[PDB]
Amino acid sequence: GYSPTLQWQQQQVAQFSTVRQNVNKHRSHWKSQQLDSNVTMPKSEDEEGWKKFCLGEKLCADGAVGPATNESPGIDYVQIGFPPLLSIVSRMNQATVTSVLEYLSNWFGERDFTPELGRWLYALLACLEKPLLPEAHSLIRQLARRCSEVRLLVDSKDDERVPALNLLICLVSRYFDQRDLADEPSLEY
């Protein structure tokens, strides 16, 4: 069923609808307490606070090689920082993360794509609701196109990540209905 890949395609997007259901369940639980349980939002006028607080500085220090992770063995929450959660995200506006997107693009590095952001990438879609502003539609188009550059660099199409990457692109085209990125055949004459 190389041609009919719709079956697998549904599973990817299908998960997105499911994710929203989970949020509703925790809505009642969070309502039982205010934003103070474990969420500190730096003043709005301090844009620097949002970028650092939300993405933390641990990314800069990196943690995966081994000793880098244990670069602060004292407690736990401190050497872990504040990770993204429903409570943190629930208070964040759709527009707030949108502006923060500009800073992310600045890193550029072409060949760079830091798979670390991917974990974060999913949160952005969950934070987007209602119709996307004209500007919002344009930006999502920008990041998807850049990814294509990585494929050219890859020596072998049968790589190992390519399959996941292929599925990832399909998600954007159907969910947002952006037929512009959709891989249409040939109109079938």
Binding site: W8, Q12, V19, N22, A123, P163, A164
Partner: peptide, 26 residues
């Protein structure tokens, strides 16, 4: 009681979704 409920249901559900999508290759 003290009442400290909040982790009753894996709130990390969002995190789990990350591995499944990427894992989609095995």
């Amino acid at each position: 009681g003290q009442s400290d409920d909040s982790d009753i249901w894996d709130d990390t559900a969002l995190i789990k979704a990350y591995d499944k999508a990427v894992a989609s290759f095995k």
